Design an enzyme around this catalytic site. Sequence first.
Site, PDB file in Angstrom:
ATOM      1  N   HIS A   1     -10.355   7.084  -0.363  1.00  7.03           N
ATOM      2  CA  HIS A   1     -10.423   6.348  -1.563  1.00  7.03           C
ATOM      3  C   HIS A   1     -11.439   5.482  -1.533  1.00  7.03           C
ATOM      4  CE1 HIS A   1      -5.779   6.674  -1.929  1.00  7.03           C
ATOM      5  NE2 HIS A   1      -5.982   6.906  -0.477  1.00  7.03           N
TER       6      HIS A   1
ATOM      7  N   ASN B   1       0.167   4.968  -3.310  1.00 11.86           N
ATOM      8  CA  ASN B   1      -0.264   6.227  -4.210  1.00 11.86           C
ATOM      9  C   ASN B   1       0.324   6.116  -5.446  1.00 11.86           C
ATOM     10  OD1 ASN B   1      -2.517   6.758  -2.388  1.00 11.86           O
ATOM     11  ND2 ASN B   1      -1.338   8.463  -1.464  1.00 11.86           N
TER      12      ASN B   1
ATOM     13  N   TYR C   1      -5.855   1.734   9.957  1.00 13.89           N
ATOM     14  CA  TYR C   1      -6.274   0.743   9.245  1.00 13.89           C
ATOM     15  C   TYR C   1      -6.966  -0.407   9.851  1.00 13.89           C
ATOM     16  CZ  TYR C   1      -4.103   3.283   5.281  1.00 13.89           C
ATOM     17  OH  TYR C   1      -3.492   4.284   4.463  1.00 13.89           O
TER      18      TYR C   1
HETATM   19  C1  HDD Z   1      -4.140   8.410   9.982  1.00 16.03           C
HETATM   20  C2  HDD Z   1      -4.766   8.042   8.877  1.00 16.03           C
HETATM   21  C3  HDD Z   1      -4.261   7.912   7.491  1.00 16.03           C
HETATM   22  C4  HDD Z   1      -3.173   8.119   6.921  1.00 16.03           C
HETATM   23  C5  HDD Z   1      -1.849   9.312   7.687  1.00 16.03           C
HETATM   24  C6  HDD Z   1      -3.103   7.950   5.757  1.00 16.03           C
HETATM   25  N1  HDD Z   1      -4.308   6.827   5.421  1.00 16.03           N
HETATM   26 FE1  HDD Z   1      -4.306   5.675   3.809  1.00 16.03          FE
HETATM   27  N2  HDD Z   1      -6.252   5.340   4.589  1.00 16.03           N
HETATM   28  C7  HDD Z   1      -6.729   5.331   5.729  1.00 16.03           C
HETATM   29  C8  HDD Z   1      -6.155   6.081   6.743  1.00 16.03           C
HETATM   30  C9  HDD Z   1      -4.858   6.989   6.516  1.00 16.03           C
HETATM   31  C10 HDD Z   1      -8.054   4.770   6.370  1.00 16.03           C
HETATM   32  C11 HDD Z   1      -9.023   5.820   7.194  1.00 16.03           C
HETATM   33  O1  HDD Z   1      -7.909   3.568   7.472  1.00 16.03           O
HETATM   34  C12 HDD Z   1      -8.392   3.758   5.115  1.00 16.03           C
HETATM   35  C13 HDD Z   1      -9.668   3.909   4.519  1.00 16.03           C
HETATM   36  C14 HDD Z   1     -10.317   2.468   4.165  1.00 16.03           C
HETATM   37  C15 HDD Z   1      -9.278   1.734   4.817  1.00 16.03           C
HETATM   38  O2  HDD Z   1      -9.230   0.718   4.612  1.00 16.03           O
HETATM   39  O3  HDD Z   1      -8.301   2.542   5.256  1.00 16.03           O
HETATM   40  C16 HDD Z   1      -7.295   4.518   4.065  1.00 16.03           C
HETATM   41  C17 HDD Z   1      -7.267   4.082   2.765  1.00 16.03           C
HETATM   42  C18 HDD Z   1      -6.220   4.236   1.833  1.00 16.03           C
HETATM   43  C19 HDD Z   1      -6.091   3.355   0.603  1.00 16.03           C
HETATM   44  C20 HDD Z   1      -7.379   2.670  -0.010  1.00 16.03           C
HETATM   45  C21 HDD Z   1      -7.184   1.179  -0.078  1.00 16.03           C
HETATM   46  C22 HDD Z   1      -8.105   0.550  -0.757  1.00 16.03           C
HETATM   47  O4  HDD Z   1      -7.941   0.596  -1.900  1.00 16.03           O
HETATM   48  O5  HDD Z   1      -8.810  -0.102  -0.178  1.00 16.03           O
HETATM   49  C23 HDD Z   1      -4.950   3.862   0.046  1.00 16.03           C
HETATM   50  C24 HDD Z   1      -4.383   3.246  -1.220  1.00 16.03           C
HETATM   51  C25 HDD Z   1      -4.379   4.585   0.977  1.00 16.03           C
HETATM   52  N3  HDD Z   1      -5.018   4.835   2.193  1.00 16.03           N
HETATM   53  C26 HDD Z   1      -2.892   5.072   0.721  1.00 16.03           C
HETATM   54  C27 HDD Z   1      -2.244   5.921   1.579  1.00 16.03           C
HETATM   55  C28 HDD Z   1      -1.083   6.320   1.546  1.00 16.03           C
HETATM   56  C29 HDD Z   1      -0.100   6.149   0.441  1.00 16.03           C
HETATM   57  C30 HDD Z   1      -0.806   7.195   2.807  1.00 16.03           C
HETATM   58  C31 HDD Z   1       0.492   7.839   3.084  1.00 16.03           C
HETATM   59  C32 HDD Z   1       1.775   7.459   2.673  1.00 16.03           C
HETATM   60  C33 HDD Z   1      -2.001   7.280   3.594  1.00 16.03           C
HETATM   61  N4  HDD Z   1      -2.829   6.315   2.883  1.00 16.03           N
HETATM   62  C34 HDD Z   1      -1.968   7.850   4.732  1.00 16.03           C
END
Ligand code: HDD
Lengths: 675, 673
Positions: B62, B135, B349
């Site tokens: 993202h 999402n 996160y």
């Molecule tokens: C095991 C890790 C993992 C998993 C299974 C998911 N995500 Fe995630 N997501 C991350 C690890 C992550 C992260 C690496 O932690 C991010 C990158 C930036 C941040 O703050 O968190 C992230 C960012 C991130 C953002 C961007 C937020 C922003 O605008 O700053 C969104 C909208 C989502 N994710 C949504 C989802 C949804 C709807 C998931 C499943 C239902 C999902 N993620 C599963």
Amino acid sequence: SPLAAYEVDDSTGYLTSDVGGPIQDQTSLKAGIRGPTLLEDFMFRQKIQHFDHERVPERAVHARGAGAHGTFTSYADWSNITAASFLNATGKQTPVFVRFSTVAGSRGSADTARDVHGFATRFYTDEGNFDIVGNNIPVFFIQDAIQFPDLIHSVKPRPDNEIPQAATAHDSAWDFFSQQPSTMHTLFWAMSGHGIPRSYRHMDGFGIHTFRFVKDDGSSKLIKWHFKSRQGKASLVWEEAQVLSGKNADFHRQDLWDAIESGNGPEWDVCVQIVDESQAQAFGFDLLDPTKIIPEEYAPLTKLGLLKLDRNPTNYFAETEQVMFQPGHIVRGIDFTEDPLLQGRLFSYLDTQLNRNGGPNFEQLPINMPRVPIHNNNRDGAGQMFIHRNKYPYTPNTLNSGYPRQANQNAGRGFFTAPGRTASGALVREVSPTFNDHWSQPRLFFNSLTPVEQQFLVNAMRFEISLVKSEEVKKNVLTQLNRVSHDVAVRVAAAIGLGAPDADDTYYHNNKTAGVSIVGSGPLPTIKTLRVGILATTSESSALDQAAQLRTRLEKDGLVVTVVAETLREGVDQTYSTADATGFDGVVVVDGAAALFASTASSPLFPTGRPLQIFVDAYRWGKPVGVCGGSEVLDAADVPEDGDGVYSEESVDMFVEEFEKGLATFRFTDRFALD
Amino acid sequence: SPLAAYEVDDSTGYLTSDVGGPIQDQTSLKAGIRGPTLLEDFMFRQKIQHFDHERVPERAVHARGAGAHGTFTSYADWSNITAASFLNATGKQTPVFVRFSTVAGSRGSADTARDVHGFATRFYTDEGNFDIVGNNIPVFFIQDAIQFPDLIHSVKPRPDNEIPQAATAHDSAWDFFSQQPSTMHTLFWAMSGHGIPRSYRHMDGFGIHTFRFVKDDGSSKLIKWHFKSRQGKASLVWEEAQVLSGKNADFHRQDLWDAIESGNGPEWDVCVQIVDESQAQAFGFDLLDPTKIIPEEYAPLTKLGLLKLDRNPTNYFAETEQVMFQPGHIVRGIDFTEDPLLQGRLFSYLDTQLNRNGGPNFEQLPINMPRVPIHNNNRDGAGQMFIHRNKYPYTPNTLNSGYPRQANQNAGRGFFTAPGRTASGALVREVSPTFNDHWSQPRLFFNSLTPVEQQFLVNAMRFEISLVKSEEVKKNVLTQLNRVSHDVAVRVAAAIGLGAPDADDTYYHNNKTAGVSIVGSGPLPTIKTLRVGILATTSESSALDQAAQLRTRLEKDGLVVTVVAETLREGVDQTYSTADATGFDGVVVVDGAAALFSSPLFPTGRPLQIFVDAYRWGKPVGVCGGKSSEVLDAADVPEDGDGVYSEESVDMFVEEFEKGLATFRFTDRFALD
Ligand code: HDD
Ligand code: HDD
Ligand SMILES: [Ca+2]
Ligand SMILES: [Ca+2]
Ligand SMILES: [Ca+2]
Ligand SMILES: [Ca+2]
Ligand SMILES: [Ca+2]
């Protein structure tokens, strides 16, 4: 060598942690089969912590780019002009790594944005790493490094909304250009086809700054670095570049990658202009001023050696993302000049690696290591990968027998500052008045382009300036453009509905210089790697046969051929749905496919009109185009049979012979209207 | 702004260092006028050090996105179902910040790539920050958070050459999809128009996971979050998205930014499906499985309140780049479930913010701060901004009189884990068999799309899968697709010159569900903000006159009008050189410009290509003034076509045309198999 030692093979074996304990990584450990995940799942946490921390800051400029390995080979023993060890013998080979780039865009921005381009070359010499951190344009926007954040803030997206990506086509950029007239020269270059090169292989490299070559007797001369492409000079047209940014943001990196994989690694002659110290002001401008070129009529190029890129990286992040260039990576036989742009760069490139790497040991990453032993008293720091055996890392010492020994001009092949250099005068924050002509050279450059090239430059400015919202900025832009050329100012003003200021002839002139025009540089010296799209159909076995026949004939000559049809099958590479004219340097329709080009042709397999739109786009963008089989197609496109670069032959052989001449011509510029 | 305390004004004053010393910053200090720069030039070094250190790591996923401030307003007291303070009274308002995004691309990649999209919302509640990190697609590709690096590696660029940017259209992605069949449901959503939304305002947001609502008395219910757009659902077409990625990589962020600036800030009804704990397996799948939706026919939406975004940021980096969302930002009244995807997110996160911020005090950034007091014994760390007065930061203490006090279910409004939750069984790394149907729900979704929409989805698959070089991967893809729908497999196979495997009907069915179709979702509820390009000419003073009159009549209705001509002047917004059909939702030619339909001022053919592209892409198009045949015939556009307009009357023309903008796309213009 440091790269080979750190290569990790994962073609066999069981999954392990980073400490070699065999593990799994597909299911979390849970308290019951529908239960919550456990904190004690170290397999989960180590894999996800790694993932969570994958990214590093992108480079503050030139964030978008791509790299390759190769070799530099000296043509001679250049001891007569420099002590540099990499240049001290005929045939001496030095490994290199080059990264090419845009400037303004972030990571993921498109390759085919209009921009200045980087051309950064590392020579892993036997007397240390030597970097020439250059651009594809020989002059810079600004005259003092302290202004770089101003320039870069202005061109990068507006900081309230971060719009627009990878573009100077906004108020702030043109506000800066109009207020800081030093920008004119590079501006004119960026608004030419040099801002939208066909590939990294079809552009040159420049050090920009005057540097010094220093001999082992202490004497020095002034030099400019030019890397001259052996592939020829070629550009896109703007309308093509814009579509290509959408259709393939990776176009330049893929073109590079592909050329290397096919055994067509790109080459450049590494050259210098060499002039005496006494000629610092002799050419009508100051050699310390990075907004000026030395016209080749005043100082010819000497060919020092061959640069060849011939090996792609194994891991992009480890190699290309992590390469950390510095103009401070200098070797004995080279020295700096008092160019205030260069002078400040030396600070920036050492400091910024701390941001990228997060710690001070960035020279230990394999891509940044040298190929000679390191002997110094630098210690500790996060990420320290050495185990130093010298327990008295201070100078002077007796307890380590006075090692490491100091190197200097007299001994140890030490770097030394050119000993003829001096300074005199007050400690000042003042610009030399020798830097004040901001307009004559922009006019020199503009004068040296062909008429259609001048038109393209005008049209680039018309495009971008018409997107500036501020009427005052637009007026101030015309004020500056008018100092270069009244005619440019008038022609640009007409698109934006303003009147040009009255002519101000202070800097006007009719002088030209060789070697700056793309359109004027003659046919390309090779067509190997250029791309031919053959538009065919699966309906007619005749169409596929004609396509195969052309394929064999074109492939023999090193062209990359794509046969496009409605659907894939043996001999068809690409469906119409995924094809675009931006993917080809020339387009051929086999006459057996004529039905697909009719206005009523329609298929659920590709968008309405796609086959014809490929052909028409290719023609409008200047490309060689034709029909092979001896009519309907040329008329459906409104493409004239008599036009230069339009081919119409029943004979496959005659077609290919004529068509290949048109690929070397590359662009048919008579298809573009003039003012 | 809600962040006004932290704003810095530079509309007046003399340049200073960061420590308030007035300085200059335009010329370096040199030993002589043509001399070398001096190390003692602190002005130079402080400025360039800051420049050199401006960048921070992009988000791991993202990375490409944009945000805005707004307000959430509760429609009722939801005490009946949740202790959540922000939902405890009718009309109660809570500030929000929302970021929207793509998933795979880096910073600077295009908004209109085909991808899943993020929709992350922070509520700055009076009992703590609460984030819903969602999402625009209600289901996720995978069933266990441990798999996230595998998914993401496979969809991001190949790691030898970092190609391709912002795209699933490569071997590695389709390899992963075809070997991990869980991915089918999300894959079908992403290959639908939900992969290329018209704007962030024209998409919904989903929490994906089942969460719990928890009342003050400890009882709990199972919920899914849905944020339903009050702008309507709309997509681009794929050819259009591809050109738009080149012409305007910033299209979604600009659309948003402009909507707010014009007083058209986008709205969503914040809704939940609310079911009993006993229904965790009642619907034919497991509510712990994030690859499944609860069909609305089984559990209707309850509207909780209104989300409105109405204020753009002041500094994008400070606000949008730095906002650090977490599902661990939870409040009393909400709880987690044992969804193994959610469970592992909670770790990610909190950890990833250390990478982005470079230190542990990232909740002190203005955009991350709460709007209520903080009382805890967290201390020190790089970047520590607080000056803590309590010099006994341990519990239990007497020396600070036992403060801060512990908060829990019974005291101090503490968060508490839903007390009916339990766990049983062996400690296992095994997948529940209740998760094993990967194919029925994808079929449900596909069955719910209209015929042309089904064709678009087939066409997206044909486009991407034709780019996969491996014949083996292609075959494996067909194998999976065929378990969803044999016809989908057959139609995709035809494009890539392979045979589909025979029907395997284990998971086939004809059931449908409401609310998932875009093309089926009926006219847009509002046309305000939609973009009308009027193609005119400076040659004919009457064409400009016609454009002016159309402009007036269209602007009255809240449409964004662009008049296009060869050159700028009074009343003309845009040159043909910078115009493109991707910049408009409808295109009108004034009949005084019919002669345009070559010049040094724009590329050959440009005026007609704007009209033709618009027609091909489904948009309402027409000719205003009475004389339409010269333009329409040049375009090959039939006068009698649906969404093709010809009227002399400016009022008649606009009344008709506005109906076409609400219809949005004329799908009759697309060929079917
Ligand atoms: C095991 C890790 C993992 C998993 C299974 C998911 N995500 Fe995630 N997501 C991350 C690890 C992550 C992260 C690496 O932690 C991010 C990158 C930036 C941040 O703050 O968190 C992230 C960012 C991130 C953002 C961007 C937020 C922003 O605008 O700053 C969104 C909208 C989502 N994710 C949504 C989802 C949804 C709807 C998931 C499943 C239902 C999902 N993620 C599963
Ligand atoms: C005072 C600052 C400053 C100034 C005046 C310049 N640059 Fe620079 N340049 C940087 C500060 C910088 C930097 C912030 O230090 C970067 C970012 C990443 C890095 O390693 O150094 C950089 C990166 C960078 C790269 C990318 C290297 C790579 O591929 O990793 C190239 C090619 C150039 N620059 C070339 C130039 C040229 C030809 C200049 C003028 C002749 C120039 N820069 C002026
Ligand atoms: Ca701006
Ligand atoms: Ca050109
Ligand atoms: Ca791949
Ligand atoms: Ca750090
Ligand atoms: Ca508890």
